Amino acid sequence: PCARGSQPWQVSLFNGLSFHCAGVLVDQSWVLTAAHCGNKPLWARVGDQGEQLRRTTRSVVHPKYRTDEHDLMLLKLARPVVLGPRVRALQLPYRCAQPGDQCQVAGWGTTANKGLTCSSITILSPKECEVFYPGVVTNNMICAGLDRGQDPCQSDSGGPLVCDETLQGILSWGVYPCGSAQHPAVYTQICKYMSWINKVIRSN
Ligand SMILES: [Zn+2]
């Protein structure tokens, strides 16, 4: 799946020589990922050796960061990306995606060489995720239903949820157990964080 050249904003984050999290390129100098990936230090391979390698300097965890709540972290790249056909930022949400929308998640298969697979996903409502996770606070989350027969563990951690070539979410938890699509994952709802994201990026 996942046609070649799509997902130019896909980012793999490494600690040491080891894989850690995925992330999105939201600016030529900025990558966004889950705060729970902030063990640190990290470095970012961008684009879909490696097309462009960079490392991070500033790592801004959301101030408001049971599961991780408000887990969002902005990684600053040492040197800016050169925006190509190959590597581009992902447009940030100007709007919130509603339950029922068809979205997409691309993943390399960590949490189970390389290569990206695309799976379509259905926004569920912050209601029937309380069924799978009774006691969850949603409000700032979107639960993404994966279609049956799909292995949830093909996503990564920090990976993007794209809807209509917008970034609506960063994967927080809800991937395990592998082997069943029946449970939805839990993404940070990114259209609720725009005030903060634009402020640390200084992108206004
Ligand atoms: Zn987390």
From Swiss-Prot:
Q: What is its EC number?
A: 3.4.21.-
Q: Does the keyword Ion transport apply?
A: no
Looking at the record, the residues that make up the Peptidase S1 domain are 1-202
Alphabetical keyword list: Cell cycle, Disulfide bond, Glycoprotein, Hydrolase, Protease, Secreted, Serine protease, Signal, Tumor suppressor
Superkingdom of origin = Eukaryota
Task: Give the enzyme's main class according to its UniProt record, as a single word.
Answer: hydrolase
Localization per Swiss-Prot or TrEMBL: Secreted
Query: What broad class describes the main subcellular location of this protein?
Result: secreted
Active-site residues annotated for this sequence? 36, 71, 157
- Give a GO molecular function annotation for the protein: serine-type endopeptidase activity
Tell me which GO cellular component terms the UniProt record holds. Answer: extracellular region; extracellular space; secretory granule
Q: To which protein family does this belong?
A: Belongs to the peptidase S1 family. Kallikrein subfamily.
Function in brief:
Has a tumor-suppressor role for NES1 in breast and prostate cancer.
Protein name from the UniProt record: Kallikrein-10
Q: Which residues of the full protein are shown?
A: 51 to 276 of 276
